[PDB]
Short mmCIF file of C-alpha atoms in Angstrom, two decimals:
data_model
loop_
_atom_site.label_atom_id
_atom_site.label_comp_id
_atom_site.label_asym_id
_atom_site.label_seq_id
_atom_site.Cartn_x
_atom_site.Cartn_y
_atom_site.Cartn_z
CA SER A 1 73.30 89.27 125.47
CA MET A 2 76.96 88.14 125.50
CA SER A 3 78.97 89.18 122.44
CA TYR A 4 80.17 85.46 122.59
CA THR A 5 79.86 81.91 123.85
CA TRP A 6 82.74 79.81 123.60
CA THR A 7 82.92 75.83 123.70
CA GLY A 8 86.62 74.66 124.44
CA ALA A 9 87.99 74.72 120.90
CA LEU A 10 91.12 76.36 120.11
CA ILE A 11 90.97 78.84 117.08
CA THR A 12 93.15 76.99 114.63
CA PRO A 13 95.62 78.07 112.07
CA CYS A 14 95.36 76.77 108.39
CA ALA A 15 98.49 78.11 107.09
CA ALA A 16 102.22 78.05 108.42
CA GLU A 17 102.31 81.31 110.32
CA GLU A 18 105.63 83.09 111.11
CA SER A 19 105.78 85.51 114.11
CA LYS A 20 109.58 86.48 114.00
CA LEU A 21 110.92 88.91 111.49
CA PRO A 22 112.18 86.58 108.56
CA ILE A 23 115.49 88.66 108.83
CA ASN A 24 117.10 89.49 105.42
CA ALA A 25 119.80 91.00 103.84
CA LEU A 26 117.44 93.46 102.25
CA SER A 27 115.44 93.82 105.34
CA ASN A 28 118.54 94.85 107.06
CA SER A 29 118.91 97.63 104.46
CA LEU A 30 115.64 99.30 106.18
CA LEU A 31 115.41 98.13 109.81
CA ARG A 32 117.98 96.88 112.17
CA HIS A 33 116.09 96.05 115.23
CA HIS A 34 114.05 93.10 113.95
CA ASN A 35 113.60 91.60 117.34
CA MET A 36 111.22 94.50 118.16
CA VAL A 37 109.02 93.44 115.20
CA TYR A 38 106.53 90.62 115.35
CA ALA A 39 103.23 89.20 113.95
CA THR A 40 100.29 88.02 115.61
CA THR A 41 99.10 84.39 115.37
CA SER A 42 96.73 81.73 116.70
CA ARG A 43 98.71 81.13 119.81
CA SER A 44 97.19 84.23 121.13
CA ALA A 45 93.72 83.82 119.93
CA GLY A 46 92.80 82.82 123.21
CA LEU A 47 93.90 86.03 124.88
CA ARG A 48 91.65 87.96 122.59
CA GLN A 49 88.89 85.74 123.12
CA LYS A 50 88.46 87.33 126.76
CA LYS A 51 89.03 90.97 126.00
CA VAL A 52 86.36 90.48 123.42
CA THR A 53 83.77 88.65 125.59
CA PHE A 54 81.15 90.42 127.67
CA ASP A 55 77.45 91.54 128.20
CA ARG A 56 75.74 94.18 126.03
CA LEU A 57 72.89 96.10 127.48
CA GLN A 58 71.13 98.84 125.60
CA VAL A 59 68.75 101.64 126.49
CA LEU A 60 67.58 103.37 123.33
CA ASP A 61 66.50 107.11 123.33
CA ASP A 62 64.20 109.53 121.64
CA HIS A 63 67.47 111.30 120.38
CA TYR A 64 68.51 107.77 119.12
CA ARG A 65 64.88 107.22 117.36
CA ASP A 66 64.90 110.92 116.18
CA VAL A 67 68.38 110.15 114.42
CA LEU A 68 67.44 106.97 113.11
CA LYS A 69 64.19 108.34 111.54
CA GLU A 70 66.14 111.32 109.91
CA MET A 71 68.41 108.65 108.48
CA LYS A 72 65.66 106.42 107.15
CA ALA A 73 64.22 109.41 105.37
CA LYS A 74 67.61 109.88 103.48
CA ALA A 75 68.19 106.26 102.77
CA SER A 76 64.82 106.01 101.46
CA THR A 77 66.12 108.27 98.78
CA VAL A 78 68.20 105.54 97.39
CA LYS A 79 67.42 103.24 94.67
CA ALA A 80 69.88 100.23 94.51
CA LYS A 81 69.92 97.07 92.45
CA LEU A 82 71.05 93.56 92.82
CA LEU A 83 74.15 92.59 91.10
CA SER A 84 73.93 89.96 88.54
CA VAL A 85 76.02 86.74 89.27
CA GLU A 86 78.66 87.75 86.75
CA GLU A 87 79.24 91.20 88.14
CA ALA A 88 79.35 89.81 91.45
CA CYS A 89 81.99 87.24 90.55
CA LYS A 90 83.86 90.14 88.95
CA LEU A 91 84.20 92.08 92.03
CA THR A 92 86.01 88.99 93.87
CA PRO A 93 89.53 89.09 94.56
CA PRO A 94 91.73 86.39 93.33
CA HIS A 95 92.97 85.99 96.79
CA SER A 96 89.74 85.25 98.57
CA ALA A 97 89.64 82.01 100.93
CA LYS A 98 88.27 79.20 98.73
CA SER A 99 84.83 77.72 99.10
CA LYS A 100 84.49 74.66 101.21
CA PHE A 101 82.51 73.52 98.25
CA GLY A 102 85.28 72.65 95.82
CA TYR A 103 85.52 75.95 93.96
CA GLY A 104 87.85 78.72 94.68
CA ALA A 105 88.29 82.41 93.83
CA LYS A 106 89.29 82.04 90.01
CA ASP A 107 86.58 79.60 89.19
CA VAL A 108 84.42 82.59 90.59
CA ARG A 109 85.87 84.82 88.29
CA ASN A 110 85.79 82.58 85.23
CA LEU A 111 82.04 81.88 85.73
CA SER A 112 82.42 78.17 86.22
CA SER A 113 79.68 75.75 86.46
CA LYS A 114 80.76 74.53 90.04
CA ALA A 115 81.17 78.21 90.95
CA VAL A 116 77.85 79.84 89.58
CA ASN A 117 75.91 76.70 90.19
CA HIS A 118 76.85 77.07 94.15
CA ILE A 119 76.20 80.70 93.98
CA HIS A 120 72.72 80.01 92.42
CA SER A 121 72.22 77.56 95.35
CA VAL A 122 73.12 79.78 98.38
CA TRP A 123 70.73 82.44 96.62
CA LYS A 124 67.84 80.00 96.03
CA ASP A 125 68.49 79.00 99.68
CA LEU A 126 68.91 82.52 101.04
CA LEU A 127 65.31 83.20 99.53
CA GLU A 128 63.68 79.70 100.57
CA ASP A 129 65.22 79.77 104.37
CA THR A 130 65.33 82.93 106.50
CA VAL A 131 66.27 81.27 109.91
CA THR A 132 68.79 78.90 109.67
CA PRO A 133 71.93 80.32 111.05
CA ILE A 134 74.72 80.30 108.68
CA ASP A 135 78.15 78.83 109.27
CA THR A 136 80.95 81.03 109.39
CA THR A 137 84.75 80.42 110.17
CA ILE A 138 86.84 82.24 112.64
CA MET A 139 90.63 82.95 112.64
CA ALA A 140 93.44 84.62 114.45
CA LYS A 141 94.68 87.33 112.07
CA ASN A 142 98.43 87.67 111.06
CA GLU A 143 99.61 91.15 110.90
CA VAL A 144 102.77 92.80 112.29
CA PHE A 145 103.47 95.38 114.66
CA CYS A 146 106.27 96.69 116.99
CA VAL A 147 106.49 95.54 120.64
CA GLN A 148 104.52 97.99 122.80
CA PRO A 149 106.55 101.06 123.74
CA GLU A 150 107.21 99.52 127.26
CA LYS A 151 109.64 96.63 126.95
CA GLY A 152 106.94 93.98 126.91
CA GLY A 153 103.39 94.47 125.91
CA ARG A 154 102.34 92.52 122.76
CA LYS A 155 99.09 92.68 120.94
CA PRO A 156 97.14 89.34 120.58
CA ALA A 157 95.91 88.44 117.24
CA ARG A 158 92.74 90.03 115.89
CA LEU A 159 89.86 87.49 115.09
CA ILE A 160 88.31 87.75 111.65
CA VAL A 161 84.93 86.00 111.10
CA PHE A 162 83.76 85.45 107.53
CA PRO A 163 80.91 83.21 105.92
CA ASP A 164 81.73 81.16 102.79
CA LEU A 165 82.70 82.22 99.29
CA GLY A 166 79.45 81.32 97.99
CA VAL A 167 77.73 83.52 100.63
CA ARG A 168 80.36 86.52 99.89
CA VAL A 169 79.40 86.46 96.21
CA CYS A 170 75.73 86.57 97.25
CA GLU A 171 76.32 89.42 99.75
CA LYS A 172 77.67 91.04 96.84
CA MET A 173 74.84 90.47 94.44
CA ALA A 174 72.49 91.99 97.11
CA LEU A 175 74.43 94.49 98.93
CA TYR A 176 77.53 95.84 97.02
CA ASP A 177 75.42 98.78 95.52
CA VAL A 178 73.57 99.54 98.64
CA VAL A 179 76.99 99.31 100.65
CA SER A 180 78.86 101.75 98.30
CA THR A 181 76.04 104.14 97.63
CA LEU A 182 73.78 104.54 100.62
CA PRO A 183 76.34 105.66 103.27
CA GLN A 184 77.22 109.12 101.62
CA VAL A 185 73.35 110.03 101.15
CA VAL A 186 72.58 109.14 104.60
CA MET A 187 75.58 110.66 106.32
CA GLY A 188 76.57 113.45 104.03
CA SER A 189 79.86 115.12 104.40
CA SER A 190 80.26 113.22 107.61
CA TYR A 191 81.09 110.10 105.44
CA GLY A 192 85.01 109.49 105.84
CA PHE A 193 85.39 107.08 102.98
CA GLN A 194 84.16 109.33 100.51
CA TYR A 195 87.35 111.55 101.18
CA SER A 196 90.91 111.26 99.65
CA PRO A 197 93.63 111.74 102.34
CA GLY A 198 93.71 115.33 100.88
CA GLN A 199 90.25 116.05 101.15
CA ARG A 200 89.95 114.50 104.58
CA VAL A 201 92.41 117.31 105.83
CA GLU A 202 90.55 120.00 103.85
CA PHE A 203 87.51 119.14 105.70
CA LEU A 204 88.86 118.88 109.25
CA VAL A 205 90.93 122.40 108.79
CA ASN A 206 87.81 123.75 107.36
CA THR A 207 85.43 122.59 109.83
CA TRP A 208 87.78 123.78 112.38
CA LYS A 209 88.23 127.11 110.91
CA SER A 210 84.28 127.59 110.64
CA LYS A 211 84.19 127.39 114.44
CA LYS A 212 84.63 130.61 116.33
CA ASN A 213 85.83 128.77 119.39
CA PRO A 214 86.97 125.21 118.04
CA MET A 215 86.99 122.07 120.29
CA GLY A 216 87.09 118.51 118.91
CA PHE A 217 87.63 114.98 120.23
CA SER A 218 88.05 111.65 119.03
CA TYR A 219 86.06 108.76 120.46
CA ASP A 220 87.89 105.19 120.80
CA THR A 221 85.25 102.80 121.36
CA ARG A 222 86.49 99.40 122.72
CA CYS A 223 86.19 96.48 120.25
CA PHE A 224 83.50 98.22 118.43
CA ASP A 225 82.72 94.82 116.67
CA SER A 226 82.07 93.27 119.98
CA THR A 227 79.66 96.08 121.26
CA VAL A 228 77.26 95.97 118.07
CA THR A 229 74.10 94.28 119.20
CA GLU A 230 71.69 92.23 117.26
CA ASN A 231 69.26 95.18 117.52
CA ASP A 232 71.95 97.52 115.89
CA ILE A 233 72.35 95.02 113.17
CA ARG A 234 68.52 94.71 112.75
CA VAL A 235 68.12 98.57 113.01
CA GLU A 236 70.88 98.36 110.03
CA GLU A 237 68.76 96.30 107.77
CA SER A 238 65.73 98.65 108.26
CA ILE A 239 67.72 101.44 106.81
CA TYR A 240 68.88 99.32 103.85
CA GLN A 241 65.14 98.22 103.32
CA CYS A 242 64.19 101.98 103.19
CA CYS A 243 65.99 101.74 99.86
CA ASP A 244 64.03 101.03 96.71
CA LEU A 245 65.30 97.30 96.14
CA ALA A 246 64.34 94.78 93.79
CA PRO A 247 62.01 92.23 95.52
CA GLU A 248 64.59 89.37 95.43
CA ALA A 249 67.21 92.05 97.12
CA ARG A 250 64.90 92.60 99.91
CA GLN A 251 64.39 88.86 100.72
CA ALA A 252 68.25 88.65 100.31
CA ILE A 253 68.86 91.48 102.79
CA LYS A 254 66.39 90.07 105.38
CA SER A 255 67.75 86.68 105.19
CA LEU A 256 71.46 87.26 105.40
CA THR A 257 70.60 89.76 108.23
CA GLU A 258 68.83 87.07 110.48
CA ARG A 259 71.23 84.15 109.32
CA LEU A 260 74.54 85.62 109.33
CA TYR A 261 74.92 89.36 110.23
CA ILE A 262 72.93 88.95 113.46
CA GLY A 263 75.15 86.20 114.49
CA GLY A 264 75.76 82.57 114.11
CA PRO A 265 78.09 79.40 114.93
CA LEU A 266 81.94 79.53 114.86
CA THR A 267 83.83 77.06 113.06
CA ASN A 268 87.72 76.88 113.13
CA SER A 269 90.18 75.89 110.33
CA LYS A 270 89.54 72.03 111.10
CA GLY A 271 85.80 72.00 111.18
CA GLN A 272 85.54 72.08 114.72
CA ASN A 273 82.88 74.32 116.53
CA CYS A 274 84.28 77.20 118.81
CA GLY A 275 81.33 79.04 120.06
CA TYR A 276 78.46 81.44 119.20
CA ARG A 277 78.55 85.01 117.86
CA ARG A 278 75.94 87.54 118.48
CA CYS A 279 77.86 90.76 117.81
CA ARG A 280 79.37 91.94 114.38
CA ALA A 281 81.50 89.73 112.24
CA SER A 282 84.54 91.41 110.73
CA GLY A 283 84.60 89.32 107.63
CA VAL A 284 81.13 90.19 106.19
CA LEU A 285 80.29 92.63 103.43
CA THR A 286 78.16 95.15 105.75
CA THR A 287 80.66 95.42 108.36
CA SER A 288 82.35 98.55 107.05
CA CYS A 289 79.01 100.47 106.05
CA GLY A 290 77.27 98.95 109.18
CA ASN A 291 79.76 100.11 111.72
CA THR A 292 79.89 103.79 109.93
CA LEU A 293 76.11 103.83 110.21
CA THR A 294 75.79 102.59 113.52
CA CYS A 295 78.64 104.87 114.87
CA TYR A 296 77.20 107.77 113.39
CA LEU A 297 73.67 107.09 114.74
CA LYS A 298 75.04 106.45 118.38
CA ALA A 299 77.31 109.53 118.14
CA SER A 300 74.66 111.67 116.51
CA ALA A 301 72.25 110.99 119.37
CA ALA A 302 74.98 111.11 121.84
CA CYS A 303 75.87 114.57 120.79
CA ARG A 304 72.24 115.93 121.30
CA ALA A 305 72.56 114.50 124.85
CA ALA A 306 74.76 117.59 125.47
CA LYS A 307 75.76 119.86 122.74
CA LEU A 308 73.53 122.76 122.34
CA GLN A 309 76.10 123.93 120.00
CA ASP A 310 77.41 122.98 116.54
CA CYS A 311 78.62 119.63 116.12
CA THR A 312 80.49 118.19 113.09
CA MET A 313 81.56 114.72 112.78
CA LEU A 314 83.42 112.50 110.51
CA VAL A 315 82.88 108.80 110.78
CA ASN A 316 85.02 105.98 109.26
CA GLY A 317 83.61 102.68 110.73
CA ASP A 318 84.42 102.81 114.27
CA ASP A 319 86.65 105.73 114.11
CA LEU A 320 84.99 108.96 114.96
CA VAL A 321 86.12 112.53 115.45
CA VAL A 322 83.77 115.54 115.88
CA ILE A 323 84.44 119.27 116.20
CA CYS A 324 82.29 121.65 117.80
CA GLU A 325 82.08 124.93 119.65
CA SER A 326 83.82 125.27 123.06
CA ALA A 327 82.26 126.53 126.16
CA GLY A 328 85.21 126.40 128.38
CA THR A 329 87.62 123.77 129.72
CA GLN A 330 85.98 122.43 132.56
CA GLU A 331 82.49 122.67 131.02
CA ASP A 332 83.64 121.21 127.85
CA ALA A 333 85.16 118.11 129.94
CA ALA A 334 81.83 117.31 131.64
CA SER A 335 80.50 117.69 128.03
CA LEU A 336 82.52 114.61 126.96
CA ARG A 337 81.23 112.99 130.09
CA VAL A 338 77.87 113.08 129.15
CA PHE A 339 78.48 112.21 125.56
CA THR A 340 80.39 108.99 126.78
CA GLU A 341 77.51 108.24 129.29
CA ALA A 342 75.03 108.19 126.24
CA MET A 343 77.44 106.24 124.11
CA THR A 344 77.89 103.52 126.75
CA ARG A 345 74.05 103.38 127.18
CA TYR A 346 73.85 102.78 123.40
CA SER A 347 76.54 100.11 123.86
CA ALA A 348 79.66 101.88 122.57
CA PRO A 349 81.72 102.20 125.77
CA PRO A 350 85.09 103.82 125.37
CA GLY A 351 88.72 102.21 125.27
CA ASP A 352 90.27 105.48 126.31
CA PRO A 353 88.14 108.27 127.44
CA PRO A 354 87.44 111.23 125.09
CA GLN A 355 89.69 114.15 126.13
CA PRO A 356 88.73 117.42 124.55
CA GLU A 357 91.52 118.93 122.22
CA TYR A 358 92.16 122.46 121.34
CA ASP A 359 94.97 121.76 119.20
CA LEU A 360 93.68 120.37 115.89
CA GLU A 361 97.02 118.58 115.24
CA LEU A 362 96.63 116.73 118.38
CA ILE A 363 93.38 115.17 117.43
CA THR A 364 94.61 111.71 116.05
CA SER A 365 91.71 109.77 114.14
CA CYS A 366 91.95 106.83 111.99
CA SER A 367 95.12 105.97 113.69
CA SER A 368 96.39 109.44 111.93
CA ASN A 369 96.29 113.37 112.54
CA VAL A 370 96.65 116.73 110.69
CA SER A 371 99.94 118.44 110.65
CA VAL A 372 101.38 121.47 108.90
CA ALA A 373 104.36 122.05 106.69
CA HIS A 374 105.49 124.67 104.20
CA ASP A 375 105.51 124.14 100.33
CA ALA A 376 107.86 125.47 97.63
CA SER A 377 106.39 129.05 97.78
CA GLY A 378 106.59 128.71 101.60
CA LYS A 379 102.71 128.68 101.94
CA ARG A 380 101.41 126.76 104.87
CA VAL A 381 100.30 123.24 103.69
CA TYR A 382 98.21 121.04 105.93
CA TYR A 383 98.51 117.24 105.39
CA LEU A 384 97.61 113.79 106.79
CA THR A 385 100.27 112.18 108.78
CA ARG A 386 100.81 109.59 111.51
CA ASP A 387 103.15 107.70 113.82
CA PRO A 388 105.20 105.67 111.27
CA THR A 389 106.40 102.75 113.32
CA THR A 390 103.82 100.35 112.13
CA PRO A 391 103.99 101.15 108.33
CA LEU A 392 107.76 101.01 109.06
CA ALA A 393 107.71 97.48 110.60
CA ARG A 394 105.30 96.30 108.18
CA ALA A 395 107.55 97.91 105.52
CA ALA A 396 110.73 95.66 106.99
CA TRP A 397 108.51 92.79 106.91
CA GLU A 398 107.10 92.69 103.39
CA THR A 399 110.70 93.23 102.24
CA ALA A 400 111.94 90.09 104.09
CA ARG A 401 108.86 88.09 103.08
CA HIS A 402 106.98 88.20 99.90
CA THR A 403 103.52 89.45 100.73
CA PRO A 404 100.75 89.38 97.90
CA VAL A 405 98.79 92.23 99.53
CA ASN A 406 101.22 94.65 100.93
CA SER A 407 100.95 97.54 103.14
CA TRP A 408 103.88 99.61 101.93
CA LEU A 409 102.45 100.62 98.40
CA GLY A 410 99.34 101.86 100.12
CA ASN A 411 101.32 103.99 102.88
CA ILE A 412 103.19 105.61 100.26
CA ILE A 413 100.25 106.38 98.52
CA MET A 414 98.06 107.45 101.24
CA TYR A 415 100.89 109.37 103.13
CA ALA A 416 102.97 110.63 100.40
CA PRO A 417 103.38 113.96 101.66
CA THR A 418 104.75 113.34 104.95
CA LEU A 419 108.38 113.07 105.90
CA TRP A 420 108.59 109.40 106.95
CA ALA A 421 107.17 108.24 103.67
CA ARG A 422 108.79 110.58 101.44
CA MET A 423 112.48 109.83 102.79
CA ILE A 424 112.22 106.43 104.37
CA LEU A 425 109.62 104.57 102.41
CA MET A 426 109.92 105.88 98.73
CA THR A 427 113.79 105.94 99.03
CA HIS A 428 113.94 102.38 100.15
CA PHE A 429 111.57 100.54 97.84
CA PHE A 430 112.55 102.46 94.57
CA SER A 431 116.30 101.21 95.25
CA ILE A 432 115.09 97.66 96.22
CA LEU A 433 112.29 97.45 93.41
CA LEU A 434 114.92 99.01 90.90
CA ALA A 435 117.48 96.56 91.69
CA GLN A 436 115.41 93.42 90.87
CA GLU A 437 113.84 95.22 87.84
CA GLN A 438 110.31 95.23 89.51
CA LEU A 439 109.34 98.94 88.84
CA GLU A 440 106.98 97.99 86.07
CA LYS A 441 105.40 95.40 88.14
CA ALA A 442 101.80 96.26 89.33
CA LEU A 443 101.55 95.39 92.84
CA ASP A 444 98.31 94.82 94.79
CA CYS A 445 97.42 96.73 98.03
CA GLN A 446 94.28 98.09 99.78
CA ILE A 447 92.94 101.56 99.76
CA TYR A 448 90.05 101.62 102.45
CA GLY A 449 89.65 97.97 102.47
CA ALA A 450 89.33 97.42 98.69
CA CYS A 451 92.63 96.18 97.02
CA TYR A 452 93.86 97.63 93.86
CA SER A 453 96.38 97.04 91.21
CA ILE A 454 98.78 99.91 91.20
CA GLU A 455 101.99 100.34 89.30
CA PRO A 456 104.66 102.04 91.24
CA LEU A 457 105.68 104.07 88.20
CA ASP A 458 102.37 105.79 88.38
CA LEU A 459 102.97 107.24 91.73
CA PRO A 460 103.73 110.76 90.86
CA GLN A 461 100.90 111.00 88.87
CA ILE A 462 98.73 109.56 91.67
CA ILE A 463 100.35 111.51 94.37
CA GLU A 464 99.77 114.76 92.55
CA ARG A 465 96.17 113.95 91.89
CA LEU A 466 95.40 113.00 95.72
CA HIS A 467 97.72 115.51 97.52
CA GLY A 468 98.62 118.26 95.13
CA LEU A 469 102.02 119.23 93.57
CA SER A 470 102.79 120.64 97.15
CA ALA A 471 103.19 117.01 98.00
CA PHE A 472 106.56 117.22 96.09
CA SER A 473 107.95 120.26 98.04
CA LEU A 474 106.96 120.28 101.62
CA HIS A 475 109.98 121.16 103.81
CA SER A 476 109.45 122.84 107.17
CA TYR A 477 107.96 120.15 109.11
CA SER A 478 106.59 120.62 112.57
CA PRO A 479 108.97 119.87 115.62
CA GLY A 480 106.25 117.59 116.99
CA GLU A 481 106.27 115.68 113.70
CA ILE A 482 110.04 115.42 113.38
CA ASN A 483 110.25 114.12 116.83
CA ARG A 484 107.87 111.35 116.38
CA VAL A 485 109.62 110.05 113.38
CA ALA A 486 113.11 110.63 114.69
CA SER A 487 112.24 108.86 118.03
CA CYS A 488 110.72 106.00 115.90
CA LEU A 489 113.97 105.55 113.87
CA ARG A 490 116.01 105.11 117.06
CA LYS A 491 113.61 102.64 118.37
CA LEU A 492 113.21 100.32 115.46
CA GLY A 493 116.79 100.99 114.56
CA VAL A 494 116.01 102.64 111.26
CA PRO A 495 119.10 104.59 109.72
CA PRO A 496 119.05 108.39 110.53
CA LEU A 497 117.28 110.71 108.04
CA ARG A 498 120.37 112.48 107.09
CA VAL A 499 121.66 109.15 105.68
CA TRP A 500 118.24 108.73 103.67
CA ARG A 501 119.01 111.94 102.06
CA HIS A 502 122.17 110.71 100.43
CA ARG A 503 120.73 107.35 99.87
CA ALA A 504 117.95 109.03 97.78
CA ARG A 505 120.52 111.17 95.89
CA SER A 506 121.59 107.78 94.46
CA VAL A 507 118.28 106.30 93.55
CA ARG A 508 117.19 109.28 92.02
CA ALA A 509 120.01 109.59 89.36
CA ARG A 510 119.29 105.88 88.53
CA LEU A 511 115.84 106.59 88.23
CA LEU A 512 116.33 109.71 86.02
CA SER A 513 118.86 108.12 83.88
CA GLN A 514 116.48 105.27 82.78
CA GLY A 515 114.17 108.17 81.04
CA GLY A 516 110.41 108.10 80.72
CA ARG A 517 108.15 106.84 83.53
CA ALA A 518 111.17 106.11 85.72
CA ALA A 519 112.43 109.61 85.14
CA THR A 520 109.30 111.36 86.44
CA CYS A 521 109.39 109.47 89.78
CA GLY A 522 113.06 110.27 90.28
CA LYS A 523 112.55 114.06 89.52
CA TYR A 524 109.30 114.33 91.34
CA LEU A 525 109.56 112.11 94.38
CA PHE A 526 113.35 112.82 95.22
CA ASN A 527 113.87 116.37 94.56
CA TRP A 528 113.67 116.93 98.27
CA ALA A 529 117.00 114.97 98.32
CA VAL A 530 119.12 117.10 95.85
CA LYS A 531 120.70 120.22 97.10
CA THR A 532 119.85 122.61 94.24
CA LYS A 533 116.27 121.78 93.62
CA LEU A 534 114.47 122.01 90.32
CA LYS A 535 111.26 123.96 90.01
CA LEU A 536 108.44 121.21 89.61
CA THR A 537 105.74 121.84 87.19
CA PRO A 538 102.39 120.02 87.31
CA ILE A 539 102.82 116.66 85.81
CA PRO A 540 101.33 116.43 82.55
CA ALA A 541 100.94 112.70 82.22
CA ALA A 542 98.25 112.89 84.91
CA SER A 543 94.55 114.29 84.59
CA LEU A 544 90.92 108.51 90.90
CA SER A 545 87.09 109.07 91.91
CA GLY A 546 86.30 105.47 92.65
CA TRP A 547 89.19 104.99 95.10
CA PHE A 548 87.37 106.97 97.60
CA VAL A 549 83.78 106.14 97.45
CA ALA A 550 83.16 103.87 100.42
CA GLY A 551 84.87 101.78 102.87
CA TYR A 552 85.22 97.99 102.19
CA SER A 553 87.33 96.48 105.03
#
């Protein structure tokens, strides 16, 4: 079947959408080449439509059924329960797209008659009807990037697809528990979202260490969402049903599967119809857990198609890395050849072919990689890092134009130990946030898809729990890493690190001299700036499990 069928309708914007950096006094403090920074909008939705449209054929194997059955046996070990309306409404962000039925996000949280009444309606209907396609809306995502390395290249918007608020609350009722409990049990240590960035590194390095002759590769599957078949999504449902669920949840899961998960009509912002969907929708509840379960099953069965050795994978939605024994260069290459062939048979062809790696550091996964540095006591320390171009460009943007759900807080959080986040990010927002008396204003940001309410003055506490005190003292960064950042600074026109050194000297003083919480941030986050460093003692005001339970984008 074809991932999609399009009528003629243009995907339409509902909000005014900006695509050129909203250039600002403050925005210039950070970045200077704002013309390289842009945002995806509707205008490009069409380009995307073509790259995402094709036919999916699937030849399912014994290796595939064997793995599926093993996964059902684990999943059949799960008892999940439907979440009462109230709880369901609770999990709803006060930023969600309003219902086309009058009530918006808040009423959903306040337990309003219009809200809880419609919700009870979708539900009554979800149970009553199990075949009528359910409407979904489709839009061009607006997120910022930096123009392709090569002068030109610009990425077309991403197309999100989501049902109505009422369906969403219902998704929560019947699937939230299942979707945040079952993955870990089915996939074990391979379930990426159970790991904090720190534990993710501990597991890659360890996995790598436990291998006599280590070899690993990432697998970049092209538009994973567009390769998911109805079969995949149906195969999905049966795993969930292997759970011990209330009878009303079972009928809920069967229903949403045939009505929305499997596919359905595509309506734009202006009520018109754009085409039909037969792959995975990006805005549903099961999309994260579904892609993770599906990528795992295909990758597992695909590993058996070759590797007569010891595979170990880490799976995050569509992102996948696997570390195994080596049997030589030329042989290992042909191994990834077979692996890719099986993956394509399962309908998960690669964007970029898989390349065997022998330098753990060069294995990037989840748009990031593992690198080495040294702490206070000079002991080697492995940390999670990545090209900083996007966080930076997005960083600049969110400083020019107020964004309710930012990326910078999350980047600092998830990437605190690195050199770009420590020197560039922390330095810049503390001074900015300080200037306007915002430090104590908790901002929203998203960790693994879920959005959280984090206070920036809590950073040291958070940073220490997630990465360890070492995070406040890394210093002998790898030449590979220094050159990435340093190259990205020239490109974006960000000021030189040497300059951030002295910039940070300043902010730290203003922070210290404020006493209390502001003082701790200044001393811990910016000790790397001062010349005569002080000896950091573990932070007492700190002693984050839920954050890394499951993926929810």
